[model samples]
Target: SMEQVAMELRLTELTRLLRSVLDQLQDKDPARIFAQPVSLKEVPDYLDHIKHPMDFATMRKRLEAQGYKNLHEFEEDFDLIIDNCMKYNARDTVFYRAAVRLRDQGGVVLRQARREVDSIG
Candidate 1:
C-alpha cells in the first residue's frame, strides 16, 4: 500500500486513461495497435544500457520536496513528464502510441490534452 502510494501518480493516472480508452474502443479486446507481437524494431530508441531506472523511493522524495502531496498535484507535472518521455524514450509504434495515448488523455496538457488528432475539441 505504502509502496504504491509512494510511486508517481501521474504515470498511474495516464496509464488508466490509456487503458480505459483502449478498452472502450476495442470492447475489451486485447489487440495491440502496432501488431500481433510487438518487436524492438518498432521502437524509437534502445535502452539496453541506460541506467537511472524507475526508483520510486527517489521519485517520492523529489516529489515531496516539490510540494507534490498527492495524485492531483503529481498530475500537474504529467504533461512535461510525458513530453520528456516522448522526446527521449519514444522508440516504436507501441511507444509512440503510448505517448499519444497520454497526449490524448490530457496527460500532456493537463486540462484538454485528451483530444486526438482527428477528434474535434
Candidate 2:
C-alpha cells in the first residue's frame, strides 16, 4: 500500500551483498510477508517451534548495528531467514513455497558475491 524505496548501499562487501539480496527478496515478496518479525499470536507455538527467528527488519537493524562483519556471517542470517520460514511452515503451504523461491533468488544474489574461501566459483 506504500511507495517503494531503496536500501542503503555501503562499501563493505557484506553490506553490499545484503542490500542486493534483501532488495531482491523484497521484490519477490511484494506483499512483504517476511519484512517483519512474527509475534506469538501471529504464529502459535512460534517460540516453541523455532529457536532463532529471523526477519528482514531485524536484518536491517543488524545491518545498521554492524552486527555482521563478513559474508559468512551475513550468509548464515540470510539462510536463517529462508530456512526458518520453510521449517516453521508446512511443506505444502504457500510459505514453504515462498521460501523455495527465495532460496532460488538467494543463490543468484550470492553468486555475485565472492565465496567464503573458495579459490573460484
Candidate 3:
C-alpha cells in the first residue's frame, strides 16, 4: 500500500511535468497566466483576449437603448449579470464577458472621473 502511494505521487509529478511540456507546445495556461495580478491599465488587453457572448456593437447598442449612459449604470448591470450568471446561467465563459467588458471600459472611464473628482478634493 505504501509503495502504491509512492508510485501514485511519482506518477502525479511526472504527469504535472508532462502537462507543463504539452501546455508549452499548445500555448496553454502553463503557469496560470490568467491568475496572475495585472495592472489596472492592462484590463483592456485582457478583455481583448477573453471570450464574450455579444458583439461589442450589439452590447453597446443594448446598453445605450436601456438608458445606460454612464459607467455606474454599466457597473450595476455588470454586478447583476455576474450574480445571476454564476447561479442560474449555464454559459460561464460568456456569462462573465459583460463584466469583463464593463471592467475594462470602466477602468478608464472611472479613472477620468476620479481625476475630475480629485480636482475638487
Candidate 4:
C-alpha cells in the first residue's frame, strides 16, 4: 500500500498553495464576512438560505483535521464561504462587496500562487 511509505513528502504544491489561499482570503476580508459562523440572530434566515454554511474558521479547523482528501474539497470550502456571503447579504452591502472583491482578487491570489509552484513536477 502507499501507506507503507506514508508519503514522506506531504508538501505538494497544491497542499501548500491551499494554506496561502486561505491566508490571502482571510486578510482581504474587509468586512470579516468569512471570519466565523454567522449568528442566527444576526442573519435571521441564514440557515434557511444556506444549507451548508462555510467560514474561514471552520475551514481552517477542517483542514487541520485532514478531512479534505482532494483539492476540490479544499477549494470549494473557500468558494462556499464567499458564495454564502454574497447569497446572504444584499448586493449593496459591505458583505456582498467583500465577497465580490475576493471572488476576483482572492481567486487570482490562488491562481498566481499556483503558477509559482509546480504540482507534482
Candidate 5:
C-alpha cells in the first residue's frame, strides 16, 4: 500500500514536469500540436514470434539499427505497423495489443497533463 501510494505521487509529479516540458516545446515549435490521434487496427501474425532485447542499451541499439533516429521516429514506426494491420483487417495479434497499450499509456499521460494545466488556468 505504501509503495503504491509512493508510485502514484511520483507519477503525478512526473506528469506535472511533462506538462512543463510540453510548454517549453510549444515555445520552440510555433506549430506544435498536442496528443494528435493516430487510428490503429489489428496486429500481425509474424509479430508474435519477434523477440526484443530486454536491456535498455540493447534496445536503443536495436532501434538505431532499424534507422530510428529519435523517439518520434520509433513511435511513428510502431504506429505504422498498427496502421498496416488495421488496413488488412488483422486483429488479435501481438503488435496490435502492444500498440493499444502504448496508445492508452500515452493518453493517460496527456490527460493528466491537461488536467494539471486546466487546474492552473
Candidate 6:
C-alpha cells in the first residue's frame, strides 16, 4: 500500500541518520523504543490500549544486552511485527497501543538521533 511505502521511506531516513550517529561517535547503538506484542487475542472494548504483558521494555533491554545495535537491526524485527499486525488487520483501528508507541516513541527517537548527529557533525 502507498501508506506503508511512505512510512517505510520515512523510517529509512530515520535509520540512516541514526546510523550516522553511531558511526560518528564510534560507539555501539543506543537503546531506543521498540514495539512488542501484549496479547494475541483481540478485545473489542479495549481496542485502543495495549493488553497486559507489554514486554517491549524488557525486550529492549534484552536486545541491548545481546549487542543489538542500530535502527537497522531493530527495523528488521519491527517490520516483521508490523507486517503481522497489518496482516491481522490490527492497523484498522488507528488506535492500537503498540502501533501508536512505535510511531510516536520510535519515530521521535529516530528524529532526535538525526538532529543530534547533524549538530555533532
Candidates' TM-scores?
A: 0.30, 0.76, 0.28, 0.79, 0.29, 0.37
- lDDT of every model, 2 decimals: 0.41, 0.72, 0.41, 0.75, 0.42, 0.45
The residue ranges of model 2 lying beyond 4 angstroms of the native Cα positions read 1-17, 115-121
lDDT of 2: 0.72
Candidate 3 lDDT for residue 107: 52
Residue 87, candidate 5: Cα error in Å is 22
Model 3 Cα shift for residue 21 (angstroms): 46
* Residue range 1-121, candidate 2, lDDT tens digits: 1222221222354565556666776677656778889787767889787799988898888876767766678778878888889888899988888888878876866776645323321
Better of 2 and 3 by TM-score: 2
Worst 10 residues of 6 by lDDT: 25-34
The sequence of per-residue lDDT tens digits that candidate 4 reaches over residues 1-121 is 6863454235443456667677887888867767898888877887889998988899888766655665668778888988888877899998888889888877777676556554543
Which candidate ranks first by lDDT, i.e. highest?
A: 4
What lDDT score is found at residue 110 in candidate 6? 54
Question: Model 4 off-target regions past 4 Å?
Answer: 1-5, 8-17, 113-118
Residue 104, model 1: lDDT of 66
Candidate 1 achieves a global lDDT of 0.41
Question: Model 5, 23: alpha-carbon shift in Å?
Answer: 0.8
Which parts of model 1 are misplaced by more than 4 Å?
1-66, 69-76, 107-109, 112-121
lDDT of 1 by residue, 52-73 (tens): 2222233344443544443454
Please count the clashing residue pairs in each candidate, in the order shown. Answer: 9, 0, 0, 0, 0, 0
Clashing pairs in 1: 42-92, 43-91, 43-92, 44-91, 44-92, 45-91, 104-114, 106-113, 106-114
- Relative to the unseen true structure, what is the C-alpha lDDT of residue 73 in candidate 1, on a scale of 0 to 100? 45
Which of 1 and 2 is ahead in TM-score? 2
7: Cα error in model 5, Å:
0.7
lDDT tens string, model 3, 36-118? 23333755553344333222233344443444433354445334433443433344565445445444544555465545434
lDDT for residue 22 in candidate 5, whole number 0-100: 39
The Cα error of candidate 2 at residue 19, in Å, is 2.6
State candidate 6's TM-score.
0.37
